Design a protein around this ligand. Structure first.
Ligand SMILES: NC(=O)c1ccc[n+]([C@@H]2O[C@H](COP(=O)([O-])OP(=O)(O)OC[C@H]3O[C@@H](n4cnc5c(N)ncnc54)[C@H](O)[C@@H]3O)[C@@H](O)[C@H]2O)c1
Ligand SMILES: NC(=O)c1ccc[n+]([C@@H]2O[C@H](COP(=O)([O-])OP(=O)(O)OC[C@H]3O[C@@H](n4cnc5c(N)ncnc54)[C@H](O)[C@@H]3O)[C@@H](O)[C@H]2O)c1
Ligand SMILES: NC(=O)c1ccc[n+]([C@@H]2O[C@H](COP(=O)([O-])OP(=O)(O)OC[C@H]3O[C@@H](n4cnc5c(N)ncnc54)[C@H](O)[C@@H]3O)[C@@H](O)[C@H]2O)c1
Ligand SMILES: NC(=O)c1ccc[n+]([C@@H]2O[C@H](COP(=O)([O-])OP(=O)(O)OC[C@H]3O[C@@H](n4cnc5c(N)ncnc54)[C@H](O)[C@@H]3O)[C@@H](O)[C@H]2O)c1
Ligand SMILES: C[As](C)(=O)[O-]
Ligand SMILES: C[As](C)(=O)[O-]
Ligand SMILES: C[As](C)(=O)[O-]
Ligand SMILES: C[As](C)(=O)[O-]
Ligand SMILES: C[As](C)(=O)[O-]
Ligand SMILES: [Zn+2]
Ligand SMILES: [Zn+2]
Ligand SMILES: [Zn+2]
Ligand SMILES: [Zn+2]
Ligand SMILES: [Zn+2]
Ligand SMILES: [Zn+2]
Ligand SMILES: [Zn+2]
Ligand SMILES: [Zn+2]
Ligand SMILES: [Zn+2]
Ligand SMILES: [Zn+2]
Ligand SMILES: [Zn+2]
Ligand SMILES: [Zn+2]
Ligand SMILES: [Zn+2]
Ligand SMILES: [Zn+2]
Ligand SMILES: [Zn+2]
Ligand SMILES: [Zn+2]
Ligand SMILES: [Zn+2]
Ligand SMILES: [Zn+2]
Ligand SMILES: [Zn+2]
Lengths: 373, 373, 373, 373
């Protein structure tokens, strides 16, 4: 059996910054106390993983990226009580220890164990991956571009057995982030007028969230007009582009709504568009939510008056969800046909084609690409 | 009688920026349509007024400042229905026309008639003051450093007749802003921890707000340790100065609280402290309210990452109050003994002694100085 | 695009009388010769619309009511020449073909195309709505509680582009009616004494008309004493309720004015108040204008002596205004700030909250609720 | 002389209703303060006088009716200043005290002193006639079927000495009623189309009034076709009878005029025809003037929708004339040859033949019958 043993399996390893993937043969250490070794069934390609490759996301090397996936528990560590071998699960980059301040607080979800600094190691401070002697790091409490991974129990979400791995894997990041961004972070209201910068997989998910929140007008923004057809079909009552006019996108949006934009979402990852989305919500009651991760070590410079007048500016992590709580529920909600993830998955390919996946994403020819094992 | 006629009286004029007050004899034209001419009984000296003098706040010159006051209606203009002569009123710098989007919005308050650009005129675009054959500008729909002033009806609140004008005048800016900032803009929850950057008149008011909201810890921060005694008398659990330690204030606060700073309030007017306040609240579930008025034409550069983690950053105008509905309620609550304003008034001087009032404000030797007529 | 195509949208339908609204998916056929398809931006809730529900206003079922609205022309049918796609417009329940007698007569305004018999169809006799494969009838040449509607060109007024939809929609009925009822129909002369029975949306507008005309005393009447505050503000000099005294309201009015009630307006819709309003004007030189709609199939029995003595009794449709001529002019006058429409609008809600709009009217809590799309 | 002495003379008296006159010897008391005793030269027989006999008009018994006449002032009471003995006058059944609201109001004419209640007394509340000991009552402030009568100075119009008393007496009721009904109450416009219900003495005068107003069409209506030739002679353009067709008269008239009946006058006295007259004027811009006196204590039931659509419905007392100002002018205009009264007088008989006059009226063999002394 594999339990207790070291599992030799393949994994898409990254040896250094700005280098292509390399599918090595690696060895996954068995789960120590309160850890869980998971066999990955399908993992999607989130734009964040690409950040590490680009170097806009802090990370130690070598590292096995990937964090959006579904899998089965191959073996539980000592002291594990939330899952047993055979259970279907979803690895949580955003954990839920249920013990820290942010966890004990209904309005907080950024668990203390959240890898926000590029630690690239588990709770005890070590790695569980080896490749050619040298140890390979973790990515955001997960690492899913591997046949097997080992995560802390606090980052394991037991989900329903009948859940399609290649679909619900979007609940591990992309979908839950955009949806929760509207529903739980900005808390969009019925009849509201929202704006969505960036029509990628998370962008399209925010639109879905707003629409499910009763927003009557949802304007989608993107440079890539090819994304519009998807946007309009997701819930966008309209879609425009910064380049369609020479006047500030803020002014345009104002004029379009007669100065009544109650919500704006930045779902790209640019600082320039963070100022844009802020400037675009109403100067006194408008709320601007930042979903896109800003590039590492970049300082923002804007006009504070835009905030003084009353605007609310907040950031978002995993759509404001409390991972271990909300994730299994969101899976149940999918099974009950409540939301369609299929609209998001533009490509389903075998793990080996990972390089193609990062070619597609980077060309705008795809929303979500699910790598299957 | 004086109704219908031009009134000749004394007003503290500011002929140009970076110049002292000049108490001239000016002419106050009678109230046109839906305008109200008020006899000023008591007016407080607010830091925002000093900004006009210092030159860090936009204004046309000459101009009559003052915007925190209690008065009596001398005469109403044609069409006025909410007040009649002899009525006790508080002129409002933040109007409430009850008809615009912000006014109609239950989460708004920055009425479209607000003089947010330093126009220095009333709704019809004209001034009611003249001195030496020259038209003197109005200040934020009010101008109270004058025996009489004329405001629009949307900028007048009828208050209880029994209200001590030399106390409830703070309800026209200082107290309402601070107290509102905590109870309304911030929505401080009971049992939480708050940090107030700035212990002047507004700062101390925010403490009263947090205290009214049930917060278990309210930490005051000021470089002037002479402010601490007062801060403690009005509810602060403890006070400290940034100069007390070399490590970042945000680190000190986090440590002092076990990483649990629920809310912070910038009640000073420095971009640097705005960022310190932002950073000092819990990265994921913390809220930071910008009460202080940023100096004219200065951009703010801060680390975006501070936001992304989930922090909520929001502006604050007049405590988030809908002026015409809330000011009378605060007066009613003052008369209901729900809070004391005496703790905020450290000096009560004749109007002619305004320059001494400004000296004490600047020298840190006074919270609120109230000028009487 | 949508031109020449069947639009699919949502509309609040009434399947039978004495039933709640049921927002359904409906199809709206493209405009035929001389018709115009309009996208609705905002629409008011008029008491007449509620009559259909109550069964006291004739209509064929199912039907889409709503008539007080502002919109933008989605497209124009063959032969149209007064509006073009993009034009902002107010749909007119009161046509103005300009050919018929009432149209050619400077004192007339009820065009032959006016729907006074519950025809619920367009000029060619057919419908443009379908729901579940079945025709749905129009209402008063308009039908605005739908995202899209088609009207005959005779029933559209091209208004100024800067006109705020959620405000100028009141010019499609409520305001123009009660305003003109005083200025145009009753031709209230300066110095007179007017009396308004009913202080709702239309009743308040009547008062503005009387005030505008020059009446010296405008007396408002309403069983709902909560409506007094606004009547007073709008122009009333005093208000009273039928209940305040046991003596017939006419006696009360005679005694208050010393038998000098020049004009009376019935802005309710009860036969009893129609008579009450009649008996209330001076028996020999008094004029009584009926603005309220009398319930269908109800005969009015009165004392002919009230009339014989010299009293003038006259009906009033849309305040006696000629639709396509006067609507564009009232919009322009609004933009010139001649009359205040926002005083009438107490609630702005999103279209989906229609039931709430009616319940508010029916509970006596609103004047006008504007539903926005 | 007779001045100051009780005058014994004859008069036609009704001892009770539904009883023919009885020429008796009566005593006419001298004129008290501000009264005038008049010698009746000529008096006309108006249908209203017959209402008293039939019982459909309210009056006390016994009584001396008649109210249409010309006479000469025998003696004036104390304080009289408008007329002197020998002066030719016309007694006014409709007074003009010049001090009540109606009298002072330019649009009023029903003076406060009018006997609208059936009192049959003078201003001071007493009678002046006596017969067989018992006092007989006055009628409509006049009483003219007597050789002598006493009216109040307010009910006395001094006319031109050169006026044919047997012709100008029509200016005491009939002519003035119908003529003014068109020109003053109805304000008939040039080129309009009028319809006159009732081709009797008052109707023919309305027709003369419509003809002077410049009407284009004047359609007369009567059950008695023998009345047509005269109607055509005074100005009618055509005449018809309700029985000429089975379809409602309103439809007939509409078809005849192409739905353009601007004015309708009811000069008969039936509630049914008052309604028929209403429904016969254009539903929106039509005006219906009620001239015929409705039978006492009879309620009128109609369809309020006839009024609602815009019809103006109004009463008429003495064709809208302010008796003391207008009667003298009508006489002067008569002597200016403006109109011809001869056409209205079909018979001139001596006072003793009163019964014949009433026989001819009730049989349709006479228009106006004048009784001479
Ligand atoms: N906060 C989190 O919890 C969280 C979770 C998931 C993803 N993310 C972050 O969200 C962002 C996007 O997520 P994604 O997976 O949907 O990426 P994505 O690439 O699919 O979306 C990028 C979209 O933005 C559009 N875009 C790029 N530049 C633009 C510009 N200048 N103006 C308008 N549109 C522009 C692109 O055309 C594309 O449609 C990334 O920063 C990712 O790291 C954050
Ligand atoms: N939002 C608004 O509606 C509104 C309303 C009223 C006042 N204000 C603004 O609020 C701010 C305060 O008003 P105030 O009347 O209470 O002024 P104040 O002069 O009484 O208070 C300033 C306080 O901050 C302290 N301070 C100054 N620099 C500091 C620093 N670097 N670190 C810590 N403490 C420092 C001062 O010692 C003083 O105690 C000003 O910006 C004023 O313009 C805004
Ligand atoms: N003539 C038309 O062209 C035209 C146009 C618009 C509306 N209307 C009709 O006008 C009438 C009122 O319109 P609205 O929109 O202003 O409705 P509304 O409901 O807002 O106003 C009705 C008002 O009358 C008051 N009222 C009701 N019963 C009363 C009574 N028994 N005695 C005294 N006051 C009483 C109500 O409390 C309310 O204040 C309705 O009949 C409507 O159908 C007619
Ligand atoms: N308003 C006043 O100031 C005033 C003044 C004078 C007369 N009146 C009233 O005017 C009315 C007419 O007076 P008149 O003196 O001319 O009397 P009248 O008898 O001469 O005229 C009555 C006419 O109506 C016709 N008529 C009756 N029933 C008919 C019907 N159903 N349809 C059509 N025609 C019919 C008769 O044939 C006759 O031609 C009476 O009611 C009288 O009391 C009122
Ligand atoms: C079937 As049915 C009552 O709508 O005619
Ligand atoms: C007129 As039906 C659709 O109710 O039968
Ligand atoms: C035609 As039916 C009375 O069923 O609505
Ligand atoms: C004759 As017509 C068209 O005005 O009814
Ligand atoms: C006598 As004629 C006016 O009908 O021609
Ligand atoms: Zn991701
Ligand atoms: Zn935790
Ligand atoms: Zn980009
Ligand atoms: Zn201030
Ligand atoms: Zn406002
Ligand atoms: Zn100036
Ligand atoms: Zn400072
Ligand atoms: Zn001191
Ligand atoms: Zn039916
Ligand atoms: Zn209406
Ligand atoms: Zn039908
Ligand atoms: Zn027409
Ligand atoms: Zn009612
Ligand atoms: Zn207004
Ligand atoms: Zn008569
Ligand atoms: Zn009089
Ligand atoms: Zn008697
Ligand atoms: Zn008859
Ligand atoms: Zn005979």
């Amino acid at each position: 059996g594999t339990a207790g043993k070291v599992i030799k399996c393949k994994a898409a390893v990254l040896w250094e910054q700005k280098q292509p993937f390399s599918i090595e043969e690696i060895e996954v250490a068995p789960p120590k106390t309160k850890e869980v070794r998971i066999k990955i069934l399908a993992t999607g390609i989130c734009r964040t993983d690409d950040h590490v490759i680009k170097g806009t996301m802090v990370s130690k090397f070598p590292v096995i990226v990937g964090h959006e996936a579904t899998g089965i528990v191959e073996s539980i560590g000592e002291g594990v009580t939330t899952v047993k071998p055979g259970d279907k699960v979803i690895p949580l980059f955003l954990p839920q220890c249920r013990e820290c301040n942010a966890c004990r607080n209904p309005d907080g979800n950024l668990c203390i164990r959240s890898d926000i600094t590029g630690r690239g190691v588990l709770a005890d401070g070590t790695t569980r991956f080896t490749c050619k002697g040298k140890p390979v790091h973790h990515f955001l409490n997960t690492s899913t571009f591997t046949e097997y991974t080992v995560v802390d129990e606090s980052s394991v979400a037991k989900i329903d057995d009948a859940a399609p791995p290649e679909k619900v894997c979007l609940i591990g990041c992309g979908f839950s982030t955009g949806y929760g961004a509207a529903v739980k972070t900005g808390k969009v209201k019925p009849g509201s007028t929202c704006v969505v910068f960036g029509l990628g997989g998370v962008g399209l998910s925010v639109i879905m969230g707003c629409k499910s929140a009763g927003a009557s007008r949802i304007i989608g923004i993107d440079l890539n007009k090819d994304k519009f057809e998807k946007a309009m079909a997701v819930g966008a009552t309209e879609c425009i582009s910064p380049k369609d006019s020479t006047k500030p996108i803020s002014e345009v949006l104002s004029e379009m709504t007669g100065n009544n934009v109650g919500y704006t979402f930045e779902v790209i990852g640019h600082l320039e568009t963070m100022i844009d989305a802020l400037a675009s919500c109403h100067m006194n009651y408008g709320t601007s939510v930042v979903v896109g991760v800003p590039p590492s070590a970049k300082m923002l410079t804007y006009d504070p008056m835009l905030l003084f007048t009353g605007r609310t500016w907040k950031g978002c992590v995993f759509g404001g969800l409390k991972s271990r709580d909300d994730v299994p529920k969101l899976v149940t909600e999918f099974l009950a046909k409540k939301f369609d993830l299929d609209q998001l998955i533009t490509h389903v390919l075998p793990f080996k084609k990972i390089s193609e996946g990062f070619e597609l994403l980077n060309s705008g020819q795809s929303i979500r690409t699910v790598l299957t094992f």
